[PDB]
Amino acid sequence: YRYDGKITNYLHKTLAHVPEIVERDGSIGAWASEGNESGNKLFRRFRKMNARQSKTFELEDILKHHWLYTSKYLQKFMEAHK
């Protein structure tokens, strides 16, 4: 009664093309939007804490500081080797 002529995009996508793409990419969910998205949280705080702050320079120093946040070289240090 609820699926006669209508199906949500995802229910179809998840019931149809999943085995195929898992066969092809080798895996999925590692490729998820999550690794992006989450980052958005930072973009908010880096727009307050670390912002300049004026419209001109703001994107510049957010972007820079973000890049610095992402780098491995630093995280290596912050592990403190156990």
Add this chain to the structure above:
DNA sequence: CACAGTGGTAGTACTCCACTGTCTGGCTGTACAAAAACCCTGCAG
């Protein structure tokens, strides 16, 4: 006549790298005293 921020800059200001001698302040052995703070005992109510 909020307030506590917000990063880059250019400003200023201070404080550092070699060459040297010279200075005062400070330590080590025991000897030499004068203060330091009791508690004695001594002499007195």
